[PDB]
Write a protein that binds this ligand. Structure first.
Ligand SMILES: C[C@@H]1O[C@@H](O[C@H]2[C@H](O[C@H]3[C@H](O)[C@@H](O)[C@@H](O)O[C@@H]3CO)O[C@H](CO)[C@H](O)[C@@H]2O)[C@@H](O)[C@H](O)[C@@H]1O
Ligand SMILES: C[C@@H]1O[C@@H](O[C@H]2[C@H](O[C@H]3[C@H](O)[C@@H](O)[C@@H](O)O[C@@H]3CO)O[C@H](CO)[C@H](O)[C@@H]2O)[C@@H](O)[C@H](O)[C@@H]1O
Ligand SMILES: [Mg+2]
Ligand SMILES: [Mg+2]
Lengths: 308, 307
């Protein structure tokens, strides 16, 4: 007596990237990486179990919340003691890789910091300015409970409640490139990451991962700002609500044009929350603007996809 | 007849539908001459988006387009708008403004970013702080443009541009942040059109209930209050479900799932707003795990248990 699995009905431009808080721009299938994809945001099983650092709000993706408690004489100057994004106390002993929403790539996230005072020192006073968070930094230790910020104006920043709002990403300007498939060290140098969402890869000859791709903002230079996610944030939100039991390891899904009713191509949606297609080569898909996936049926690892 | 329902989400799992931040608390407001007519966060219970409302949380108070000119005014940089998905904006559309446009008087602060296309350094990028004043005579998003204030006027080109909002404030010249005052979407001496209607209680003893956020501010002591009628996730849910409304009012209950108890009840009106039976301004204090559940369809004259 199983509750039926389903996708939300949403066009690409009605979808949010689950790894950075921006809309999806396109679909892309990639040749198989030598190192397996293991992103930690945008991870959710088909029966609604969020994994990695994944939380439900787009506005939480690559955001931080906490208090600035110290400064050190380094480029990553301002020490931010983290809270959970909802303001509750962060417990480093929880079975998560890092606070939910933490970035899951190597590079620099740029955005703004904002503060609003509490307690006895001018409570209610506010300030905001540009900031950068480097996930290469030895002070990037979100799992332990803190990250350090680079800001624009070191003289207008207090030891007060602080929020970081991301806007874009970039390479660092000194030989530390933006690498979307390289995890940061959430507990810093010499410490292994733990409680990770598993790596994903095709397990079928002739198959490739299919990604929902965004071109996110950059703050200088020529980087394309590519961030690929496995399933969009709205699918994660939907699966969490529905909690429909998975009847096999593989759901067959069809990309449909609802006006004509025709299936354009089919894909496998795997239990742990990722898509494969039968294709060989890097390939940006060209599909109609009104197109969207629908669930067709439960299949299995024997099923051979029609060539994309 | 598909049964109506709410998504099951706690307050910290909800996004404000009028600014891209989480909900912080519930608040009920004293009825007064304050007319509520927000244009973001407007959706009927059977899933019809209204006003400037669109589905993407990251589109709320965002702009997308091209910077095409500058003028010798504070609102210096002329941004021709696209729809948030990059398609051509049509000013003849039956909307108040491009979907996502801010629906309040004030200054929105955030960042602008550019990525060049065409013959001039294609692929080159830049980003910096920017402000959009919705008081500005150049704030004419319905006509297809807004003008930006930026921090560094020497590093900004005539190129594709995105504005990402971060927070709000009063202007520094005294023009206040007024969340219930609509901008003039076509500028001076024009009338707003295609508006989602004003919202108010219609039954004695009832008050609107808001989902409230305290959003970032960029100086001073503004509390950053933005109240919405229903959160973005409810709008997204109603859009997907399209469940027929069986009457003018859906009775809903705020429940503590841990204990099973109903904390209070409220009326969810078919045009997408909530009333409760209370008198006076009141920030609700309720447990963190609480959430609304649909109870039943009732009429306009159904009497709520006082809260
Ligand atoms: C591509 C630009 O990126 C940002 O400026 C970066 C800057 O660029 C300069 C180029 O190096 C130079 O060849 C010439 O084209 O002018 C550019 C801007 O003055 O390089 C510095 C380090 O050398 C920084 O990395 C800057 O971020 C952006 O501000 C510009 O508008 C360009 O898009
Ligand atoms: C509350 C501060 O807001 C920002 O600073 C503002 C600076 O505020 C001044 C007050 O106006 C003043 O009467 C008293 O409080 O001192 C403050 C600074 O001394 O005032 C200027 C006016 O020229 C600007 O409005 C600033 O925004 C923020 O930068 C500070 O950190 C405080 O939170
Ligand atoms: Mg489906
Ligand atoms: Mg319900």
């Amino acid at each position: 007596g199983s509750k039926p699995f389903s996708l939300p009905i949403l066009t690409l431009s009605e979808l949010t990237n689950s790894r950075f808080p921006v809309p999806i721009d396109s679909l892309f299938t990639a040749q198989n990486n030598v190192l397996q994809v293991q992103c930690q945001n945008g991870r959710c099983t088909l029966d609604g179990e969020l994994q990695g650092t994944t939380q439900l709000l787009p506005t939480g993706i690559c955001a931080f919340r906490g208090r600035v408690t110290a400064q050190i004489n380094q480029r990553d100057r301002w020490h931010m003691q983290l809270q959970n994004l909802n303001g509750t106390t962060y417990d480093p002993t929880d079975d998560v890789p890092a606070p939910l929403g933490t970035p899951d790539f190597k590079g620099v996230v740029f955005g703004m910091v904002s503060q609003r005072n509490v307690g006895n020192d001018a409570p209610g006073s506010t300030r905001a300015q540009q900031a950068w968070v480097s996930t290469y930094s030895p002070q990037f230790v979100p799992k332990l409970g803190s990250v350090n910020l680079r800001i624009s104006d070191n003289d207008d920043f207090q030891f007060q409640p602080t929020k970081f709002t991301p806007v874009g990403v970039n390479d660092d300007d000194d030989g530390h490139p933006f690498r979307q498939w390289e995890l940061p060290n959430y507990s810093g140098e010499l410490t292994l990451n733990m409680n990770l969402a598993p790596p994903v890869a095709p397990n079928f000859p002739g198959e490739q991962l299919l990604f929902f791709r965004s071109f996110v903002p950059c703050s200088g230079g020529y980087n394309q700002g590519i961030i690929d996610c496995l399933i969009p944030q709205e699918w994660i939100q939907h699966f969490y609500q529905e909690s429909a039991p998975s009847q096999s390891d593989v759901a067959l899904i069809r990309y449909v044009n609802p006006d004509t009713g025709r299936t354009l191509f089919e894909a496998k949606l795997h239990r742990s929350g990722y898509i494969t297609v039968a294709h060989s080569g890097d390939y940006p898909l060209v599909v109609p603007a009104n197109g969207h996936f629908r669930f067709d049926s439960w299949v299995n690892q024997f099923y051979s996809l029609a060539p994309m």
